[PDB]
Design a protein around this ligand. Structure first.
Ligand code: MNR
Ligand SMILES: CC1(C)[C@@H]2CC[C@@]1(C)C(=O)C2
Ligand SMILES: [K+]
Length: 404
């Protein structure tokens, strides 16, 4: 715990630990939902991880992400040392300076690139699933959730697959550190990995994402090696620790709900809609902003330098935004959420993300329509900047499957 600030009252003090929530046993989304009970106010202050504010309602979360004049992304992570050390592009920048870098990033992970990767995304998903199909079991996180998105990213970035263990270890320390590395150390290690590669590719320009970024232009002018490094690092974290985790949350749910599997099996055209609803119910990101100065936000005096966590995860879980929020309804009329962010920093990889999600759902249910959680298994989650699933052992009767 950290000493309570002067401007911070006492009634709004909710000691929530984003890296180890109290009710984590009931599921991470459930763990964060406690901040939305009637007994909890919209905005509270926690003395965990150094102390910071936490907007618990979609209304304030959205509003803050729109007002970059008061809530700067210069220091988006908690603890403060992580946020101060955090210098990824375009995320650590505020408009207007931020805007120019998003276009370059779009060139390597935007829809146009997703279109090119279409065949390979499809091919890998089918190959991985068909290999598991006759086994009647798997460790989903390790056998599919990780290799599917990560191998696609490494392909696009032109990096050898043998480097995945090292890179995945580093990305995970920046989102869910095990204590062996500070965010700054993990970040510098990722940059150390990228530096020589970016230099190599600025000399012999290739087709990969790192080459395109490294030799790119920012609103008409050349990108520096430092700027390319800072952008490439972010792309690595996005490709290695986002969809990877979400897929496990989604499959855990399907493994636990036969009725929902049946729905998508009977009406595959609903998969895209199902994806969106799962993105809301199993939202998993939570980063924030920093006050550029003294500001009275919703009757709560915010001082300059103060960090405020704006959980993208909480918006769509707000009973005020969606009726019966913890319930998964593929026919939900208005699936409200900020799973991919809000404001000028809206996720640039959401198109690649949705394609990977939709393809996984369609191709998995096509070959393994029926599956369940391994008997006696208790699924354990993990919380942090990006929440995840520790392990997801699945089982099924091979006789109920079908090879395409
Ligand atoms: C490899 C590419 C990426 C993939 C895949 C990907 C997949 C996902 C994903 C999967 C389910 C979720 C959820 C996700 C969530 C986010 N994502 Mn996404 N993301 N994502 C980026 C690359 C990627 N994301 C980049 C780049 C930005 C920064 C944009 C900017 O700062 O202007 C971004 C930004 C964001 C933000 C904004 C954070 C902020 O405002 O500080 C959220 C939230
Ligand atoms: C919060 C995020 C998911 C977004 C893309 C990767 C991430 C960890 C960042 O640093 C920006
Ligand atoms: K910073």
């Amino acid at each position: 715990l950290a000493p309570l600030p002067p401007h911070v009252p006492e009634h709004l003090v909710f000691d929530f630990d984003m890296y180890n929530p109290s009710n984590l046993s009931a599921g991470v989304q459930e763990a964060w939902a406690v901040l939305q009970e009637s007994n909890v106010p919209d905005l509270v202050w926690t003395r965990c991880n150094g102390g910071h504010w936490i907007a618990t309602r979609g209304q304030l979360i959205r509003e803050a992400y729109e007002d970059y004049r008061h809530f700067s992304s210069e220091c988006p992570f908690i603890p403060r040392e992580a946020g101060e050390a955090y210098d990824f592009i375009p995320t650590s920048m505020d408009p207007p300076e931020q805007r120019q870098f998003r276009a370059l990033a779009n060139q390597v992970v935007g829809m146009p690139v997703v279109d090119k990767l279409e065949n390979r995304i499809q091919e890998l998903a089918c190959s991985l699933i068909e290999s598991l199909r006759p086994q009647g079991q798997c460790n989903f996180t390790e056998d599919y959730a990780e290799p599917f998105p990560i191998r696609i990213f490494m392909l696009l970035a032109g990096l050898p697959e043998e480097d995945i263990p090292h890179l995945k270890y580093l990305t995970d320390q920046m989102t869910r550190p095990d204590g062996s590395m500070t965010f700054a150390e993990a970040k510098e290690a990722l940059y150390d990995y990228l530096i020589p590669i970016i230099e190599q590719r600025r000399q012999k320009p290739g087709t990969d994402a790192i080459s395109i970024v490294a030799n790119g232009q920012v609103n008409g002018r050349p990108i520096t090696s430092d700027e390319a490094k800072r952008m490439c690092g972010l792309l690595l974290v996005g490709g290695l620790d986002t969809v990877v985790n979400f897929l496990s949350f989604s499959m855990e749910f399907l493994a636990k709900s036969p009725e929902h599997r049946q729905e998508l099996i009977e009406r595959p055209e609903r998969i895209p809609a199902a994806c969106e609803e799962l993105l809301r119910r199993f939202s998993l990101v939570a980063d924030g902003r920093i006050l550029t100065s003294d500001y009275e936000f919703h009757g709560v005096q915010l001082k300059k330098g103060d960090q405020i966590l704006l959980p993208q995860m909480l918006s769509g879980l707000d009973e005020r935004e969606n009726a019966c929020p913890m319930h998964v309804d593929f026919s939900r009329q208005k699936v409200s959420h900020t799973t991919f962010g809000h404001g000028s920093h809206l996720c640039l990889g959401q198109h690649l993300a949705r394609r990977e999600i939709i393809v996984t759902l369609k191709e998995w249910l096509t070959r393994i329509p029926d599956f369940s959680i391994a008997p006696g298994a208790q699924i354990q989650h993990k919380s942090g900047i990006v929440s995840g699933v520790q392990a997801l052992p699945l089982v099924w009767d091979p006789a109920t499957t079908k090879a395409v």
